[PDB]
């Protein structure tokens, strides 16, 4: 028996609104410590790692580990049937090939029951090494999304160049070029609206903007976003899920 009661259900909705466009299908690993997901997109250029820790839920029960082959399209379709203020319960058995989703409205007098068909999956998982990165930039999520959106008008690629005092995003195309320079902020009057940079060595990397534009659909999950970059390795775009866990987008560079 697996049962997770989550009061702030909208979170999960957001989780599915940040995934279903990048990955159509994924394996959801359910354990006593919570929910884990890892999945490359069909082009294997990007990867996603989702973590929803058990303490994030209002209640949580998981006797034995379960691997749920899930169609994220249908799951997003089902989560579309849940309100923002809805309390959502996930429930699954062991000898059952489905996932139950119970939506409770704040009346209380409206109750929804949804049974999602689970599927078979032949997927690839990657071993991700626990490492330290040369550049770590913490910035507003909306700012990053806006930057990617804007530079998407210039070219296909974006050059992220991080120094110690500033982070720059550049783009070049047949109409010309564009440079966006964000300086470090004196966070003497704030905390989340600030742009901070932790640098060991200056880093310069080039990435595909379409994948980043796929990534920035996790913006409603957090007011902040962190970018981890090292030389000639995949970029990590992390969104923190408050009182819950995180969502990480890995993107292979253009060496």
């Amino acid at each position: 028996m697996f049962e997770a009661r989550l009061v702030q259900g909208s979170i999960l909705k957001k989780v599915l609104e940040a995934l279903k466009d990048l990955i159509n299908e994924a394996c959801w690993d359910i354990s006593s410590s919570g929910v884990n997901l890892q999945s490359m997109d069909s082009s294997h250029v990007s990867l996603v790692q989702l973590t929803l820790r058990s303490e994030g839920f209002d209640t949580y029960r998981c006797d034995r580990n379960l691997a749920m082959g899930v169609n994220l399209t249908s799951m997003s379709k089902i989560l579309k049937c849940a309100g923002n203020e809805d309390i959502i319960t996930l429930r699954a058995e062991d000898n059952a090939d489905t996932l139950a989703l119970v939506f409770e409205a704040p009346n209380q007098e409206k109750v929804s029951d949804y049974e999602m068909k689970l599927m078979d999956l032949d997927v690839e998982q990657l071993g991700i090494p626990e490492q330290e990165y040369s550049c770590v930039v913490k910035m507003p999520s909306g700012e990053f999304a806006r930057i990617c959106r804007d530079l998407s008008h210039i070219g296909d690629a974006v050059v992220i160049s991080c120094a110690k005092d500033g982070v720059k995003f550049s783009a070049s195309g047949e109409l010309g070029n564009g440079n966006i320079k964000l300086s470090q902020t004196s966070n003497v009057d704030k905390e989340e609206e600030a742009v901070t940079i932790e640098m060991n060595e200056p880093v310069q990397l080039t990435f595909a903007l379409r994948y980043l534009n796929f990534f920035t659909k996790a913006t409603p999950l957090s007011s902040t976003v962190t970018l981890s970059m090292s030389a000639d390795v995949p970029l990590v775009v992390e969104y923190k899920i408050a009182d819950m866990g995180h969502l990480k987008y890995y993107l292979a560079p253009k060496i």
Binding site: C27, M40, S43, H44, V45, S46, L47, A67, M68, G69, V70, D97, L118, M119, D120, L121, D122, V123, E124, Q125, L126, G127, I128, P129, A157, T206, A208, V233, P234, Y250, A252, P253, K254, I255
Partner: peptide
């Protein structure tokens, strides 16, 4: 730039069979 790499050029790929 020169070539768009993939995630499997950096991380080791583990194949998994999930039944449901």
């Amino acid at each position: 730039k020169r070539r768009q790499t993939s995630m499997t050029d950096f991380f080791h790929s583990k194949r998994r069979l999930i039944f449901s």
